[PDB]
Amino acid sequence: GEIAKSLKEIAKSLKEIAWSLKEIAKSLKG
Amino acid sequence: GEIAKSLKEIAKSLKEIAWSLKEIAKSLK
Amino acid sequence: GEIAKSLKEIAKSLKEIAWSLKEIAKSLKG
Amino acid sequence: GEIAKSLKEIAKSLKEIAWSLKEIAKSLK
Amino acid sequence: GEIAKSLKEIAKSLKEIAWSLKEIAKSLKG
Amino acid sequence: GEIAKSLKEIAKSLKEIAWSLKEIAKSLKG
Ligand SMILES: CC(C)=CCC/C(C)=C/CC/C(C)=C/CO
């Protein structure tokens, strides 16, 4: 349903955010 | 419903946040 | 209910966070 | 219930995160 | 339940995230 | 169900995010 759909959206965005933050963390080493 | 509306609202900001962090990740390379 | 109330709070905070990250992204371009 | 309790904690933490990100934005100006 | 269990994990993670961002904010002052 | 699955994904992502932010905080000290 709508809630599930949004949660999948939220889950996809958090995966992207995690990836970007991993990238940032790697850059600041360095 | 309200939860659903809030969840759509929640999903949009996280897209903005994801984009900004992509930009930030790009600047820092 | 409490859950809805909390979700509206959560939504508001995420808007503040998104805004701050836009600012941060801008500063780091220079 | 437990879900409601957790969401309140989540809201509280997001307020803290928001405050910190404002401080971070100020520093980078 | 499974949902409640996940929310506690999420709540725990957000506390850690808040803590880390506070440390980051402090470091960026000087 | 799907909601629980998404929340597990969300919980997993926030753990990653928390971890990356610790790395970033450590780096800014340093
Ligand atoms: C509202 C529920 C079910 C999950 C929301 C999780 C969430 C709002 C995480 C935000 C993490 C964040 C924006 C970090 C920014 O550095």
Side-chain angles (χ1 to χ4, degrees), chain A residues 3-4 7-8 10-11 14-15 17-18 21-22 24-25 28-29, chain F residues 2-3 6-7 9-10 13-14 16-17 20-21 23-24 27-28:
Chain A
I3 290 181
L7 285 182
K8 280 188 186 60
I10 288 161
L14 284 176
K15 286 192 178 63
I17 286 164
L21 283 171
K22 164 192 87 51
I24 290 161
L28 294 181
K29 293 300 181 193
Chain F
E2 282 291 10
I3 288 182
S6 290
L7 284 181
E9 291 297 303
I10 285 162
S13 286
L14 284 176
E16 298 285 331
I17 289 163
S20 294
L21 283 169
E23 289 294 329
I24 290 162
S27 298
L28 294 182

Short mmCIF file of all heavy atoms in Angstrom, two decimals, chain A residues 3-4 7-8 10-11 14-15 17-18 21-22 24-25 28-29, chain F residues 2-3 6-7 9-10 13-14 16-17 20-21 23-24 27-28:
data_model
loop_
_atom_site.label_atom_id
_atom_site.label_comp_id
_atom_site.label_asym_id
_atom_site.label_seq_id
_atom_site.Cartn_x
_atom_site.Cartn_y
_atom_site.Cartn_z
N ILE A 3 1.75 3.28 2.43
CA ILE A 3 2.77 3.31 3.46
C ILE A 3 3.99 2.49 3.05
O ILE A 3 5.14 2.94 3.15
CB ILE A 3 2.21 2.79 4.78
CG1 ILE A 3 1.20 3.81 5.33
CG2 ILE A 3 3.33 2.55 5.78
CD1 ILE A 3 0.60 3.39 6.66
N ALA A 4 3.73 1.29 2.56
CA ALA A 4 4.78 0.40 2.09
C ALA A 4 5.56 1.04 0.95
O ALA A 4 6.78 0.97 0.92
CB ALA A 4 4.19 -0.93 1.66
N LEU A 7 7.80 3.64 2.28
CA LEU A 7 8.88 3.04 3.04
C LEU A 7 9.95 2.49 2.12
O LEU A 7 11.15 2.57 2.43
CB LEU A 7 8.33 1.95 3.95
CG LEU A 7 7.59 2.53 5.16
CD1 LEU A 7 7.11 1.42 6.07
CD2 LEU A 7 8.45 3.52 5.94
N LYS A 8 9.54 1.95 0.98
CA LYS A 8 10.50 1.52 -0.02
C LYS A 8 11.27 2.73 -0.57
O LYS A 8 12.47 2.65 -0.81
CB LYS A 8 9.81 0.78 -1.17
CG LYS A 8 9.49 -0.68 -0.86
CD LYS A 8 8.98 -1.40 -2.10
CE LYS A 8 8.51 -2.82 -1.79
NZ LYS A 8 7.41 -2.86 -0.79
N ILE A 10 11.84 5.58 1.03
CA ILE A 10 12.67 6.00 2.14
C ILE A 10 13.87 5.06 2.24
O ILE A 10 15.02 5.51 2.39
CB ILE A 10 11.83 6.00 3.44
CG1 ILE A 10 10.83 7.17 3.41
CG2 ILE A 10 12.71 6.04 4.68
CD1 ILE A 10 9.67 7.02 4.38
N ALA A 11 13.62 3.77 2.10
CA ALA A 11 14.69 2.79 2.14
C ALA A 11 15.68 3.02 0.99
O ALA A 11 16.89 3.03 1.22
CB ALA A 11 14.12 1.36 2.10
N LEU A 14 17.79 6.14 1.80
CA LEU A 14 18.73 5.90 2.88
C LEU A 14 19.92 5.08 2.39
O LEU A 14 21.06 5.26 2.86
CB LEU A 14 18.05 5.21 4.05
CG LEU A 14 17.17 6.16 4.87
CD1 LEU A 14 16.48 5.38 5.92
CD2 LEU A 14 18.02 7.26 5.49
N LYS A 15 19.69 4.19 1.43
CA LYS A 15 20.80 3.47 0.82
C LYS A 15 21.71 4.44 0.09
O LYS A 15 22.94 4.35 0.19
CB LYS A 15 20.30 2.38 -0.14
CG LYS A 15 19.71 1.16 0.56
CD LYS A 15 19.50 0.01 -0.40
CE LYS A 15 18.97 -1.21 0.32
NZ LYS A 15 17.63 -0.95 0.93
N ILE A 17 22.04 7.69 0.70
CA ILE A 17 22.64 8.53 1.73
C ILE A 17 23.82 7.81 2.38
O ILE A 17 24.87 8.41 2.59
CB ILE A 17 21.57 8.95 2.77
CG1 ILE A 17 20.65 10.01 2.14
CG2 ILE A 17 22.21 9.50 4.05
CD1 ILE A 17 19.35 10.22 2.89
N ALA A 18 23.63 6.53 2.69
CA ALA A 18 24.68 5.68 3.26
C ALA A 18 25.87 5.62 2.31
O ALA A 18 27.02 5.78 2.71
CB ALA A 18 24.16 4.27 3.55
N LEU A 21 27.67 9.01 2.24
CA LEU A 21 28.40 9.21 3.48
C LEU A 21 29.62 8.31 3.57
O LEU A 21 30.64 8.70 4.13
CB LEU A 21 27.50 8.99 4.68
CG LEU A 21 26.58 10.20 4.89
CD1 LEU A 21 25.53 9.91 5.94
CD2 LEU A 21 27.41 11.44 5.25
N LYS A 22 29.52 7.10 3.01
CA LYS A 22 30.70 6.24 2.95
C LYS A 22 31.76 6.91 2.08
O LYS A 22 32.93 6.95 2.45
CB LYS A 22 30.36 4.86 2.38
CG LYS A 22 31.60 4.08 1.96
CD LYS A 22 31.25 2.86 1.15
CE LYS A 22 31.11 3.22 -0.33
NZ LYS A 22 32.28 3.99 -0.85
N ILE A 24 32.09 10.15 1.45
CA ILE A 24 32.61 11.34 2.13
C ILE A 24 33.65 10.92 3.17
O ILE A 24 34.73 11.50 3.26
CB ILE A 24 31.46 12.17 2.79
CG1 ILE A 24 30.59 12.83 1.71
CG2 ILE A 24 32.02 13.21 3.77
CD1 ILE A 24 29.20 13.28 2.20
N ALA A 25 33.32 9.88 3.94
CA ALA A 25 34.20 9.37 4.98
C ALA A 25 35.53 8.92 4.38
O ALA A 25 36.59 9.17 4.95
CB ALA A 25 33.54 8.21 5.72
N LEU A 28 37.72 11.98 3.37
CA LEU A 28 38.27 12.77 4.46
C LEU A 28 39.44 12.08 5.15
O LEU A 28 40.06 12.64 6.03
CB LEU A 28 37.18 13.09 5.48
CG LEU A 28 36.08 14.00 4.94
CD1 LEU A 28 35.07 14.29 6.01
CD2 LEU A 28 36.67 15.30 4.41
N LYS A 29 39.75 10.86 4.72
CA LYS A 29 40.87 10.12 5.28
C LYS A 29 42.19 10.59 4.66
O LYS A 29 43.22 10.63 5.33
CB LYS A 29 40.70 8.62 5.06
CG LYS A 29 39.56 7.95 5.82
CD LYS A 29 39.67 8.10 7.33
CE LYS A 29 38.51 7.40 8.03
NZ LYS A 29 38.38 7.75 9.48
N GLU F 2 5.96 -6.49 3.85
CA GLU F 2 6.73 -5.46 3.16
C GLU F 2 7.18 -4.31 4.05
O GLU F 2 8.31 -3.86 3.94
CB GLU F 2 5.93 -4.90 1.98
CG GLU F 2 5.91 -5.79 0.73
CD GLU F 2 7.28 -5.86 0.04
OE1 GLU F 2 8.30 -5.38 0.60
OE2 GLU F 2 7.36 -6.39 -1.09
N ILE F 3 6.31 -3.86 4.93
CA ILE F 3 6.66 -2.78 5.85
C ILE F 3 7.82 -3.18 6.75
O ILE F 3 8.79 -2.42 6.89
CB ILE F 3 5.44 -2.36 6.69
CG1 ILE F 3 4.44 -1.61 5.81
CG2 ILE F 3 5.87 -1.47 7.85
CD1 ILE F 3 3.22 -1.11 6.56
N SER F 6 11.04 -3.35 4.77
CA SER F 6 11.56 -2.01 4.51
C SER F 6 12.20 -1.41 5.76
O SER F 6 13.23 -0.74 5.68
CB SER F 6 10.44 -1.10 4.00
OG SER F 6 10.06 -1.48 2.69
N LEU F 7 11.58 -1.64 6.91
CA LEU F 7 12.11 -1.12 8.15
C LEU F 7 13.44 -1.79 8.48
O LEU F 7 14.36 -1.13 8.97
CB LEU F 7 11.10 -1.29 9.28
CG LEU F 7 9.98 -0.25 9.17
CD1 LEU F 7 8.97 -0.39 10.28
CD2 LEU F 7 10.57 1.16 9.18
N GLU F 9 15.50 -2.84 6.21
CA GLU F 9 16.41 -2.19 5.28
C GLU F 9 16.79 -0.81 5.81
O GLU F 9 17.96 -0.41 5.79
CB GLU F 9 15.76 -2.07 3.89
CG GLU F 9 15.58 -3.40 3.17
CD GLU F 9 16.90 -4.11 2.87
OE1 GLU F 9 17.77 -3.52 2.20
OE2 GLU F 9 17.07 -5.27 3.31
N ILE F 10 15.79 -0.10 6.31
CA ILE F 10 16.00 1.24 6.86
C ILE F 10 16.92 1.17 8.07
O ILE F 10 17.87 1.94 8.17
CB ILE F 10 14.64 1.89 7.21
CG1 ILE F 10 13.95 2.34 5.91
CG2 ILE F 10 14.81 3.08 8.15
CD1 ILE F 10 12.46 2.59 6.03
N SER F 13 20.45 0.54 6.90
CA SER F 13 21.05 1.74 6.33
C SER F 13 21.47 2.75 7.40
O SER F 13 22.54 3.37 7.28
CB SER F 13 20.07 2.37 5.34
OG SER F 13 20.01 1.60 4.15
N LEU F 14 20.67 2.91 8.44
CA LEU F 14 21.01 3.87 9.49
C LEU F 14 22.23 3.40 10.29
O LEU F 14 23.00 4.22 10.79
CB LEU F 14 19.82 4.12 10.41
CG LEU F 14 18.78 5.02 9.74
CD1 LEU F 14 17.57 5.18 10.61
CD2 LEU F 14 19.37 6.40 9.44
N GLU F 16 24.72 1.82 8.91
CA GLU F 16 25.81 2.20 8.02
C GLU F 16 26.10 3.69 8.13
O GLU F 16 27.25 4.12 8.21
CB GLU F 16 25.46 1.85 6.57
CG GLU F 16 25.23 0.36 6.30
CD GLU F 16 26.53 -0.43 6.25
OE1 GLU F 16 27.57 0.15 5.88
OE2 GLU F 16 26.50 -1.64 6.56
N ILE F 17 25.03 4.47 8.13
CA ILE F 17 25.13 5.93 8.24
C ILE F 17 25.79 6.32 9.57
O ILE F 17 26.70 7.16 9.60
CB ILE F 17 23.73 6.57 8.08
CG1 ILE F 17 23.28 6.44 6.61
CG2 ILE F 17 23.73 8.04 8.56
CD1 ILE F 17 21.79 6.66 6.38
N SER F 20 29.54 5.45 9.31
CA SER F 20 30.24 6.43 8.47
C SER F 20 30.43 7.77 9.16
O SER F 20 31.47 8.39 9.04
CB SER F 20 29.50 6.64 7.14
OG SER F 20 29.53 5.46 6.35
N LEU F 21 29.41 8.22 9.88
CA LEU F 21 29.51 9.49 10.61
C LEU F 21 30.55 9.41 11.74
O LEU F 21 31.23 10.38 12.03
CB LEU F 21 28.14 9.89 11.15
CG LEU F 21 27.23 10.47 10.07
CD1 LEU F 21 25.81 10.63 10.56
CD2 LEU F 21 27.76 11.80 9.60
N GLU F 23 33.25 7.61 11.55
CA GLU F 23 34.50 7.68 10.81
C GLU F 23 34.82 9.13 10.48
O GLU F 23 35.95 9.58 10.64
CB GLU F 23 34.43 6.83 9.54
CG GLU F 23 34.42 5.34 9.83
CD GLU F 23 35.73 4.87 10.44
OE1 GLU F 23 36.78 5.47 10.12
OE2 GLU F 23 35.70 3.92 11.26
N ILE F 24 33.80 9.86 10.03
CA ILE F 24 33.97 11.27 9.69
C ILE F 24 34.37 12.09 10.93
O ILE F 24 35.26 12.93 10.87
CB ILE F 24 32.68 11.85 9.05
CG1 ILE F 24 32.46 11.26 7.66
CG2 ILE F 24 32.72 13.39 9.01
CD1 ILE F 24 31.04 11.41 7.12
N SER F 27 37.91 11.40 11.84
CA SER F 27 38.78 12.06 10.88
C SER F 27 38.96 13.53 11.18
O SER F 27 40.05 14.08 10.96
CB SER F 27 38.24 11.89 9.45
OG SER F 27 38.19 10.53 9.08
N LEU F 28 37.92 14.19 11.68
CA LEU F 28 38.02 15.63 11.88
C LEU F 28 38.80 15.97 13.15
O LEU F 28 39.14 17.14 13.36
CB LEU F 28 36.63 16.26 11.96
CG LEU F 28 35.80 16.19 10.68
CD1 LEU F 28 34.46 16.89 10.89
CD2 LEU F 28 36.58 16.82 9.55
#
